[PDB]
Nucleic acid binder design. Structure first.
Lengths: 91, 98
DNA sequence: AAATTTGGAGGAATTTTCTCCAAATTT
DNA sequence: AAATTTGGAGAAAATTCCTCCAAATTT
């Protein structure tokens, strides 16, 4: 039922999927824990960049550099894709 | 006195390595592996919503945590996320968290 | 009581999508 | 040679942000 999962291992060396949202959640819990009442300012751009970069990279790999197919897959505009690629210096 | 913390080591996840040691790896890698498994479990089908898929998959925990952190306070949450309060309410509604 | 938050307007600012085109590139 | 892709326009559609305001809630 969960299309986006990652692989985990337990103490008995058994491997098991878990939703990406669990990773995101753990990472954030850790983030909020490490800072002690320090102020957060741009958390959305932070995470969004942290997630957009490997996405673009993997979809660009899957379509062997074909931006149009990448854009079709992702469900965004070819221009938007171009913009995002520019943003993270992947061109 | 202050060691450089790279952007990729700001949001990290505990992992286990070939010497059974617990180490923090970037969230990037989690996203990368999830996507790699998604592609691998595709076997030639057409996709048209991958961005929305990932974005939902990532927005939901973010809103969950930021709402827990601010104790339900949408204004603080909006202020630390760096988005408008109306946008935040929109998103919260979208995922039934309002 | 005073300060802050909320829910929601109307409208401006920004972003994304759409429809082109011609040059470049792949097939 | 034919088909596809790329880069980039200008305009439409859509989303986000801004600026309020009275009621509701918290301090």
């Amino acid at each position: 039922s969960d299309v986006l999962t990652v692989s985990t291992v337990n103490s008995q060396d058994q491997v098991t999927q878990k939703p990406l949202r669990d990773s995101v959640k753990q990472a954030l819990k850790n983030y909020f824990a490490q800072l002690n009442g320090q102020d957060v300012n741009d958390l959305y751009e932070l995470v969004l960049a942290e997630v957009e970069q490997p996405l673009l990279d993997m979809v660009m790999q899957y379509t062997r550099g074909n931006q149009t197919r990448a854009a079709l897959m992702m469900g965004i505009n070819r221009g938007t894709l171009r913009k995002k690629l520019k943003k993270y210096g992947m061109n």
